Write a protein that binds this ligand. Sequence first.
Ligand SMILES: O=C(CCC1CCCCC1)N1CCOCC1
Ligand SMILES: [Cl-]
Ligand SMILES: [Zn+2]
Ligand SMILES: [Zn+2]
Length: 576
Amino acid sequence: NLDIIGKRIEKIKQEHETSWHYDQDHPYKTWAYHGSYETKQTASSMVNGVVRLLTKPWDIIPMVTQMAMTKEKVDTRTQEPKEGTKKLMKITAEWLWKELGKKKTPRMCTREEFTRKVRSNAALGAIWKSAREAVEDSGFWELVDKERNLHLEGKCETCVYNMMAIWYMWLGARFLEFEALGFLNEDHWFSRENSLSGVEGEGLHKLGYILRDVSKKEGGAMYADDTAGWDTRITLEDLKNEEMVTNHMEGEHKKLAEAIFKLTYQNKVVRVQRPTTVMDIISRRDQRGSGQVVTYGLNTFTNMEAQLIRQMEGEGVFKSIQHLTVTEEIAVKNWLVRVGRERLSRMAISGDDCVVKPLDDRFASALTALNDMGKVRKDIQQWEPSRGWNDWTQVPFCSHHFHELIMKDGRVLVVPCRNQDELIGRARISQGAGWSLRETACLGKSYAQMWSLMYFHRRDLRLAANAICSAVPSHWVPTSRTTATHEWMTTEDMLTVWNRVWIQENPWMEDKTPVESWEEIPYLGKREDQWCGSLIGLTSRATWAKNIQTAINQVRSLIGNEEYTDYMPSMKRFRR
Ligand SMILES: O=C(CCC1CCCCC1)N1CCOCC1
Ligand SMILES: [Cl-]
Ligand SMILES: [Zn+2]
Ligand SMILES: [Zn+2]
């Protein structure tokens, strides 16, 4: 408690010595409250006018238009798991870090690597003006140094979370987290090659083929149970099992990683804005509160662990979570050594998101360990058996489903898909202030090129993508303010990129014959396109398509006298 967090609390107290007060009307129940102090400040979703002017039919669709308009779970608690559950998790976690570590070497990430990431724009949940200035000033690195030596001494002064769920920290605390734990992401510990259940660094063009490969295994239904508020269900036992990665480290690295887990993950200090405007300095031990990239890898680790244990329960490897006998321990260890890697291969796991094809359907009602670990399912009663999926093309994963699409030449594409209102609504939205017309156009072009690569099979998106690319100057570079593999972020011909991604580099495509034109690239069936939200069939959509050059010309007239390319004749209907 206060020995580990007291120093951080002490420091904040004095910078606001004029404002400190133990408020008696504090709303916190599960979060430890320490004090308050005076502040005055806050974010809306702004519309992308280039995308909206080229998607007129969607201006009257509320599921699109409502997307641009407009903490009772963070303040909740999770009970301590039983002794049998704690044993299953420790055995499984010990085994899993060893498997992940067989072909990888833990290592520190460097100021050079950190500096390069900030100078190429990447979300570091951070709070000098921007990060680029701090990384160039040596005063920063001396603050970083002072904290670094405090961590080697087993103490913390400045690693404090700023709520807004995204846990922003000052750039220095972000650096120390990256130095100790960045290797999990930088060296791809959760790649499918290295973790068997992971998909880290797999583009949306890979995920469907991965689910189809899981479907080929003999076994029961495919299960895709969502957890209710995963980050809030991470227990102190989960944090202790994640910490065991430090058992694989040495020297300075081992000490620096032990401090991140001990001082910042297992004992957090947070500042929250409460209107009543006051700053609430609160603490707690449990729950996920890390940088988004470390959060992703540790969520993947703990989900892999939790799902192997649910598979053990279904297969009868242990009888009760109350307590593991001595021989159940050896049975669990022996299961992991004998079939653990095969059982990992039966899963696709992306942080809190999973798909599992178990040995049989006993898994559906194997719920005691899952509930006792705190990983309570969404939208179902605690003890009701899970509903599985009989067809891999129906399974939800990473906000998508996947279609099997046969090209006129017989070759098979497995493509990503989601309701089209969600795709159009998201492309019509931008975040942050000070967007020029050129920057807004380049963000529209990023969405368009993503649609041409991932969603070419949706009639409306291939047409709207061609229109946006026709309306934005041909040499202007696609941009995003926040950056899976983003192959659409390029000024290369998108037909050349399509061929590279779907044919040349696609390990599921044996015939490498290049496609010569967009007319060789198929769509979903007309009825399937309509099922997944297409407006084909509506008079509004027909007027848009027939008059698209008028919409393209409206946007070109706003941007002004620039060099443009007409991409519409790459489509049959505009090709004479
Ligand atoms: O049913 C249709 C055409 C559907 C087709 C379906 C395939 C893609 C192109 C469009 N119309 C009703 C509205 O007026 C225009 C004609
Ligand atoms: Cl189904
Ligand atoms: Zn610290
Ligand atoms: Zn679909």
